[PDB]
Write a protein that binds this DNA or RNA. Structure first.
Lengths: 336, 5
DNA sequence: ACCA
Protein backbone atom coordinates (compact mmCIF):
# COMPACT_ATOMS: atom_id res chain seq x y z
CA UNK A 1 0.00 0.00 0.00
CA UNK A 2 0.84 3.71 -0.26
CA UNK A 3 1.16 5.64 3.00
CA UNK A 4 -1.38 8.43 3.52
CA UNK A 5 0.78 11.15 5.08
CA UNK A 6 -2.29 12.99 6.40
CA UNK A 7 -3.36 9.89 8.43
CA UNK A 8 -1.48 10.06 11.79
CA UNK A 9 -2.34 6.48 12.79
CA UNK A 10 -0.93 5.08 9.53
CA UNK A 11 2.14 7.32 9.90
CA UNK A 12 2.83 6.15 13.46
CA UNK A 13 2.53 2.52 12.32
CA UNK A 14 4.98 3.19 9.47
CA UNK A 15 7.40 5.01 11.78
CA UNK A 16 7.30 2.26 14.41
CA UNK A 17 8.27 -0.33 11.76
CA UNK A 18 11.11 1.95 10.59
CA UNK A 19 12.40 2.76 14.09
CA UNK A 20 12.46 -0.89 15.25
CA UNK A 21 13.74 -2.58 12.08
CA UNK A 22 17.37 -3.76 12.03
CA UNK A 23 17.40 -2.38 8.47
CA UNK A 24 16.25 1.08 9.59
CA UNK A 25 18.02 4.14 8.24
CA UNK A 26 17.68 7.79 9.23
CA UNK A 27 17.38 8.76 5.55
CA UNK A 28 14.38 6.41 5.29
CA UNK A 29 12.62 7.93 8.30
CA UNK A 30 9.68 10.15 7.44
CA UNK A 31 11.57 12.93 9.25
CA UNK A 32 14.01 12.89 6.34
CA UNK A 33 11.31 14.29 4.04
CA UNK A 34 11.12 17.27 6.41
CA UNK A 35 14.86 17.78 5.99
CA UNK A 36 14.61 17.42 2.19
CA UNK A 37 11.75 19.88 2.06
CA UNK A 38 12.43 20.74 -1.61
CA UNK A 39 11.61 17.10 -2.61
CA UNK A 40 8.20 15.45 -2.79
CA UNK A 41 7.66 12.42 -0.52
CA UNK A 42 6.04 9.16 -1.66
CA UNK A 43 6.09 6.25 0.79
CA UNK A 44 5.01 2.62 0.40
CA UNK A 45 5.04 -0.57 2.46
CA UNK A 46 4.06 -4.25 2.36
CA UNK A 47 2.07 -6.23 4.95
CA UNK A 48 2.27 -9.89 5.96
CA UNK A 49 -0.77 -12.16 6.33
CA UNK A 50 -1.43 -10.67 9.80
CA UNK A 51 -1.32 -7.12 8.45
CA UNK A 52 1.94 -6.15 10.17
CA UNK A 53 4.35 -4.10 8.07
CA UNK A 54 7.30 -6.21 6.91
CA UNK A 55 8.86 -3.86 4.31
CA UNK A 56 8.85 -0.12 3.66
CA UNK A 57 10.28 2.31 1.09
CA UNK A 58 10.51 6.10 1.70
CA UNK A 59 11.02 7.83 -1.61
CA UNK A 60 11.63 11.48 -2.42
CA UNK A 61 10.87 12.90 -5.85
CA UNK A 62 13.11 15.54 -7.38
CA UNK A 63 13.02 17.68 -10.50
CA UNK A 64 15.05 17.14 -13.67
CA UNK A 65 15.54 19.07 -16.98
CA UNK A 66 12.87 16.79 -18.44
CA UNK A 67 9.15 16.21 -18.00
CA UNK A 68 9.98 13.41 -15.53
CA UNK A 69 10.81 13.25 -11.82
CA UNK A 70 13.79 11.46 -10.31
CA UNK A 71 12.58 9.18 -7.50
CA UNK A 72 15.14 8.34 -4.84
CA UNK A 73 14.93 6.07 -1.74
CA UNK A 74 18.13 7.04 0.08
CA UNK A 75 19.78 4.03 1.75
CA UNK A 76 16.45 2.25 1.30
CA UNK A 77 14.38 0.14 1.26
CA UNK A 78 14.00 -0.99 4.84
CA UNK A 79 13.98 -4.80 4.55
CA UNK A 80 16.50 -7.50 3.53
CA UNK A 81 17.21 -6.41 -0.06
CA UNK A 82 18.96 -9.75 -0.77
CA UNK A 83 15.50 -11.34 -0.59
CA UNK A 84 14.96 -10.11 -4.12
CA UNK A 85 11.50 -11.66 -4.61
CA UNK A 86 10.29 -9.59 -1.67
CA UNK A 87 12.14 -6.57 -3.12
CA UNK A 88 10.29 -6.93 -6.45
CA UNK A 89 6.96 -6.84 -4.60
CA UNK A 90 7.88 -3.68 -2.68
CA UNK A 91 9.30 -1.97 -5.78
CA UNK A 92 6.13 -3.00 -7.63
CA UNK A 93 4.17 -1.08 -4.97
CA UNK A 94 6.51 1.91 -5.29
CA UNK A 95 6.01 1.94 -9.07
CA UNK A 96 2.20 2.01 -8.77
CA UNK A 97 2.48 4.90 -6.27
CA UNK A 98 4.71 6.90 -8.63
CA UNK A 99 2.04 6.69 -11.40
CA UNK A 100 4.41 7.29 -14.30
CA UNK A 101 5.74 10.58 -12.94
CA UNK A 102 9.33 9.39 -12.53
CA UNK A 103 11.86 8.15 -15.07
CA UNK A 104 13.66 5.96 -12.48
CA UNK A 105 13.34 4.69 -8.93
CA UNK A 106 16.85 4.57 -7.44
CA UNK A 107 17.73 2.96 -4.12
CA UNK A 108 21.20 2.53 -2.58
CA UNK A 109 20.95 0.18 0.42
CA UNK A 110 23.81 -0.46 2.85
CA UNK A 111 24.35 -4.06 1.78
CA UNK A 112 27.75 -5.34 0.73
CA UNK A 113 28.64 -5.67 -2.93
CA UNK A 114 28.93 -9.24 -4.24
CA UNK A 115 29.12 -10.65 -7.75
CA UNK A 116 26.17 -12.99 -7.14
CA UNK A 117 23.91 -10.28 -5.68
CA UNK A 118 24.81 -7.91 -8.55
CA UNK A 119 24.02 -10.64 -11.08
CA UNK A 120 20.67 -11.43 -9.43
CA UNK A 121 19.57 -7.79 -9.43
CA UNK A 122 20.45 -7.52 -13.12
CA UNK A 123 18.58 -10.77 -13.83
CA UNK A 124 15.46 -9.23 -12.28
CA UNK A 125 15.78 -6.25 -14.64
CA UNK A 126 17.45 -3.62 -12.43
CA UNK A 127 20.35 -1.53 -13.69
CA UNK A 128 23.13 -1.43 -11.09
CA UNK A 129 25.80 1.26 -10.62
CA UNK A 130 28.84 0.14 -8.60
CA UNK A 131 32.16 -1.22 -9.87
CA UNK A 132 31.22 -0.34 -13.46
CA UNK A 133 31.34 3.40 -12.58
CA UNK A 134 34.06 3.17 -9.90
CA UNK A 135 36.60 4.98 -12.07
CA UNK A 136 34.60 8.24 -11.75
CA UNK A 137 35.45 8.45 -8.05
CA UNK A 138 33.48 8.90 -4.86
CA UNK A 139 30.78 11.02 -6.53
CA UNK A 140 30.05 8.48 -9.29
CA UNK A 141 27.11 7.67 -6.97
CA UNK A 142 25.02 10.10 -4.90
CA UNK A 143 26.22 8.49 -1.59
CA UNK A 144 29.75 7.12 -1.22
CA UNK A 145 29.81 3.36 -1.90
CA UNK A 146 32.95 2.66 0.19
CA UNK A 147 32.42 3.38 3.85
CA UNK A 148 34.43 3.14 7.04
CA UNK A 149 32.34 1.29 9.63
CA UNK A 150 33.42 0.27 13.15
CA UNK A 151 31.83 -3.02 14.25
CA UNK A 152 31.39 -2.60 18.01
CA UNK A 153 29.96 -6.12 18.44
CA UNK A 154 33.57 -7.38 18.14
CA UNK A 155 34.21 -5.73 21.55
CA UNK A 156 31.37 -6.90 23.84
CA UNK A 157 33.11 -5.86 27.07
CA UNK A 158 34.41 -2.44 25.95
CA UNK A 159 33.43 0.24 28.44
CA UNK A 160 35.17 3.25 26.89
CA UNK A 161 36.42 4.27 23.46
CA UNK A 162 40.03 3.48 24.42
CA UNK A 163 39.12 -0.21 24.98
CA UNK A 164 38.76 -0.57 21.17
CA UNK A 165 42.24 0.45 20.14
CA UNK A 166 45.94 -0.46 20.14
CA UNK A 167 48.28 1.46 22.39
CA UNK A 168 49.53 3.66 19.54
CA UNK A 169 45.97 4.85 18.80
CA UNK A 170 45.14 5.22 22.49
CA UNK A 171 47.92 7.86 22.58
CA UNK A 172 46.45 9.73 19.60
CA UNK A 173 43.02 9.79 21.24
CA UNK A 174 44.38 10.84 24.64
CA UNK A 175 46.33 13.81 23.11
CA UNK A 176 43.54 16.44 22.75
CA UNK A 177 42.09 15.69 26.18
CA UNK A 178 45.52 15.89 27.79
CA UNK A 179 46.04 19.29 26.09
CA UNK A 180 42.79 20.71 27.52
CA UNK A 181 40.19 19.91 24.83
CA UNK A 182 36.71 19.35 26.28
CA UNK A 183 33.65 18.11 24.40
CA UNK A 184 30.01 18.78 25.22
CA UNK A 185 26.96 17.65 23.31
CA UNK A 186 23.30 18.40 22.79
CA UNK A 187 20.76 19.21 20.13
CA UNK A 188 19.79 22.85 20.76
CA UNK A 189 20.13 26.08 18.77
CA UNK A 190 23.30 26.88 20.74
CA UNK A 191 25.15 23.78 19.50
CA UNK A 192 23.76 24.22 15.99
CA UNK A 193 25.27 27.71 15.82
CA UNK A 194 28.60 26.35 17.07
CA UNK A 195 28.48 23.60 14.44
CA UNK A 196 27.52 26.04 11.69
CA UNK A 197 30.46 28.40 12.35
CA UNK A 198 32.92 25.47 12.12
CA UNK A 199 31.04 24.00 9.14
CA UNK A 200 31.12 27.18 7.04
CA UNK A 201 34.74 27.81 8.06
CA UNK A 202 35.88 24.35 6.90
CA UNK A 203 33.77 24.74 3.74
CA UNK A 204 35.54 27.95 2.68
CA UNK A 205 38.91 26.43 3.61
CA UNK A 206 38.54 23.30 1.43
CA UNK A 207 36.82 25.24 -1.38
CA UNK A 208 33.76 22.96 -1.34
CA UNK A 209 30.03 23.61 -1.30
CA UNK A 210 27.95 23.72 1.89
CA UNK A 211 24.32 23.55 2.96
CA UNK A 212 22.39 26.51 4.44
CA UNK A 213 21.71 26.58 8.18
CA UNK A 214 17.98 25.93 7.61
CA UNK A 215 18.86 22.39 6.42
CA UNK A 216 20.29 21.61 9.85
CA UNK A 217 17.50 23.49 11.64
CA UNK A 218 14.91 21.33 9.88
CA UNK A 219 16.89 18.26 10.89
CA UNK A 220 16.96 19.45 14.53
CA UNK A 221 13.20 20.00 14.47
CA UNK A 222 12.59 16.54 12.99
CA UNK A 223 14.76 14.46 15.37
CA UNK A 224 14.97 14.46 19.17
CA UNK A 225 18.19 14.62 21.18
CA UNK A 226 18.25 10.83 21.61
CA UNK A 227 18.46 10.55 17.80
CA UNK A 228 20.45 13.64 16.75
CA UNK A 229 23.36 14.93 18.78
CA UNK A 230 25.84 17.70 18.02
CA UNK A 231 29.28 17.32 19.64
CA UNK A 232 31.29 20.50 20.27
CA UNK A 233 35.02 20.50 21.15
CA UNK A 234 36.49 23.57 22.87
CA UNK A 235 39.74 24.44 24.63
CA UNK A 236 39.39 27.10 27.33
CA UNK A 237 36.51 28.94 25.70
CA UNK A 238 37.91 28.65 22.16
CA UNK A 239 35.80 26.83 19.56
CA UNK A 240 37.81 24.15 17.76
CA UNK A 241 35.73 21.50 15.98
CA UNK A 242 32.27 19.92 15.87
CA UNK A 243 30.44 16.90 14.51
CA UNK A 244 26.83 15.85 14.02
CA UNK A 245 25.95 12.20 14.71
CA UNK A 246 22.61 10.44 14.13
CA UNK A 247 21.62 7.31 16.05
CA UNK A 248 19.12 5.14 14.16
CA UNK A 249 18.62 1.41 13.72
CA UNK A 250 21.85 -0.53 14.27
CA UNK A 251 24.27 2.37 13.95
CA UNK A 252 25.41 5.78 15.06
CA UNK A 253 26.40 7.72 11.94
CA UNK A 254 28.93 10.56 11.95
CA UNK A 255 27.34 12.65 9.17
CA UNK A 256 28.62 16.24 9.36
CA UNK A 257 31.73 17.90 10.74
CA UNK A 258 33.49 21.24 10.90
CA UNK A 259 36.72 22.62 12.35
CA UNK A 260 38.24 26.08 12.68
CA UNK A 261 41.37 27.31 10.87
CA UNK A 262 44.87 26.74 12.21
CA UNK A 263 45.75 24.63 15.23
CA UNK A 264 42.79 22.49 16.35
CA UNK A 265 44.70 20.70 19.16
CA UNK A 266 43.54 17.39 17.58
CA UNK A 267 39.98 18.29 18.61
CA UNK A 268 38.52 16.18 15.73
CA UNK A 269 39.93 13.09 17.48
CA UNK A 270 38.13 14.12 20.67
CA UNK A 271 34.81 14.48 18.85
CA UNK A 272 35.17 10.97 17.40
CA UNK A 273 36.07 9.60 20.81
CA UNK A 274 32.87 11.02 22.32
CA UNK A 275 30.66 9.89 19.41
CA UNK A 276 32.05 6.36 19.80
CA UNK A 277 31.43 6.63 23.54
CA UNK A 278 27.78 7.44 22.82
CA UNK A 279 27.59 4.24 20.72
CA UNK A 280 29.12 2.20 23.54
CA UNK A 281 26.79 3.74 26.15
CA UNK A 282 23.67 2.92 24.10
CA UNK A 283 24.87 -0.59 23.07
CA UNK A 284 24.79 0.33 19.39
CA UNK A 285 26.09 -2.32 16.97
CA UNK A 286 27.87 -0.02 14.52
CA UNK A 287 29.67 3.32 14.34
CA UNK A 288 29.69 4.57 10.74
CA UNK A 289 32.29 7.20 9.83
CA UNK A 290 30.95 7.36 6.27
CA UNK A 291 32.46 7.57 2.86
CA UNK A 292 35.97 7.49 1.46
CA UNK A 293 37.22 7.76 -2.11
CA UNK A 294 39.62 4.82 -2.07
CA UNK A 295 41.33 2.48 0.39
CA UNK A 296 44.63 4.31 -0.02
CA UNK A 297 46.96 6.52 2.00
CA UNK A 298 46.60 9.08 -0.85
CA UNK A 299 42.98 9.59 0.28
CA UNK A 300 42.89 11.96 3.26
CA UNK A 301 39.37 10.74 4.04
CA UNK A 302 40.60 7.15 4.40
CA UNK A 303 43.71 8.23 6.33
CA UNK A 304 41.78 10.11 9.02
CA UNK A 305 39.02 7.49 9.30
CA UNK A 306 41.60 4.66 9.26
CA UNK A 307 42.70 5.91 12.70
CA UNK A 308 39.35 4.70 14.03
CA UNK A 309 38.56 1.75 11.71
CA UNK A 310 41.36 -0.77 11.20
CA UNK A 311 39.10 -3.22 9.35
CA UNK A 312 38.66 -2.90 5.61
CA UNK A 313 36.13 -0.38 4.30
CA UNK A 314 32.69 -1.81 3.65
CA UNK A 315 31.86 -1.80 -0.07
CA UNK A 316 28.15 -1.62 -0.82
CA UNK A 317 26.17 -2.76 -3.86
CA UNK A 318 25.81 0.93 -4.83
CA UNK A 319 22.83 2.29 -6.79
CA UNK A 320 20.02 0.01 -7.99
CA UNK A 321 17.83 1.58 -10.70
CA UNK A 322 14.29 0.48 -11.58
CA UNK A 323 14.20 2.05 -15.05
CA UNK A 324 10.70 3.32 -15.85
CA UNK A 325 11.27 5.70 -18.82
CA UNK A 326 14.26 4.29 -20.75
CA UNK A 327 14.56 7.23 -23.14
CA UNK A 328 14.95 9.79 -20.32
CA UNK A 329 17.11 7.31 -18.37
CA UNK A 330 19.60 7.06 -21.23
CA UNK A 331 19.59 10.87 -21.53
CA UNK A 332 20.29 11.57 -17.85
CA UNK A 333 22.35 8.55 -16.64
CA UNK A 334 25.67 7.22 -17.98
CA UNK A 335 26.47 3.59 -17.16
CA UNK A 336 30.28 3.91 -16.97
CA UNK B 1 27.60 18.69 -4.26
CA UNK B 2 30.84 18.42 -2.30
CA UNK B 3 29.37 14.27 0.60
CA UNK B 4 25.77 13.07 0.07
CA UNK B 5 23.74 13.08 3.31
C1' DA C 1 50.85 18.36 3.53
C1' DC C 2 46.39 15.91 6.76
C1' DC C 3 42.18 16.80 10.83
C1' DA C 4 34.91 16.86 5.00
Amino acid sequence: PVLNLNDPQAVERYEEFMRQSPYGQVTQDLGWAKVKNNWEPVDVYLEDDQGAIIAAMSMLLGDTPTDKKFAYASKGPVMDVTDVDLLDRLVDEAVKALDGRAYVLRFDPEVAYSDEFNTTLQDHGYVTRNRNVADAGMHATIQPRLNMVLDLTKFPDAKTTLDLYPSKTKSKIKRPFRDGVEVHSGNSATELDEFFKTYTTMAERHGITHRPIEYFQRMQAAFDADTMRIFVAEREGKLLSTGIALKYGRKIWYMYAGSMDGNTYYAPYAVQSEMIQWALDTNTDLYDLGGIESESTDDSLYVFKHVFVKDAPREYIGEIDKVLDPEVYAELVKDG
Amino acid sequence: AXCXX
